């Protein structure tokens, strides 16, 4: 579904093809066959550009379209607090938040 242009953001009519072809390539197939093939899922997207272009809107929209959990977020340099060790404890906290769920519910 590509009402994105009319969803509320103009953007471009070319990105979505690449984005969701890669996403489908990654996550559509059943876990067992993907494991057997031993291919690695895509984990990581880079966005950049001048402000005021709707990057946050694009992020929310893409997060909503995919059937995933409510998106969790963090600040830009607040991660670098005036302390040595916070940059470890807080980051480990953020990752452990989902690690606990993965352990509980399993693979």
């Amino acid at each position: 579904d590509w009402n994105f242009e009319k969803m509320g953001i103009g953007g471009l009519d070319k990105e979505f093809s690449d984005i969701f072809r890669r996403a489908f390539a990654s996550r559509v197939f059943p876990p067992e066959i993907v494991e057997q093939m031993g291919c690695k899922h895509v984990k990581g997207i880079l966005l950049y550009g001048p402000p005021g272009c709707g990057k946050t809107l694009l992020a929310r929209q893409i997060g909503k379209m995919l059937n995933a959990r409510e998106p969790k977020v963090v600040n830009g340099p607040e991660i670098l607090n005036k302390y040595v060790g916070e940059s470890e404890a807080n980051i480990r906290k953020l990752f452990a938040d989902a690690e606990e769920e993965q352990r509980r519910l399993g693979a």
Binding site: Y83, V84, G85, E86, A89
Partner: peptide, 24 residues
């Protein structure tokens, strides 16, 4: 160091409680 100060805060709370039990 943050965990240390947090543990010491817990310790001071416990100390208050115990001195709040021994006095009465």
């Amino acid at each position: 160091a943050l965990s240390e100060i947090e543990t010491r805060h817990s310790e001071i709370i416990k100390l208050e409680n115990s001195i709040r039990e021994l006095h009465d």
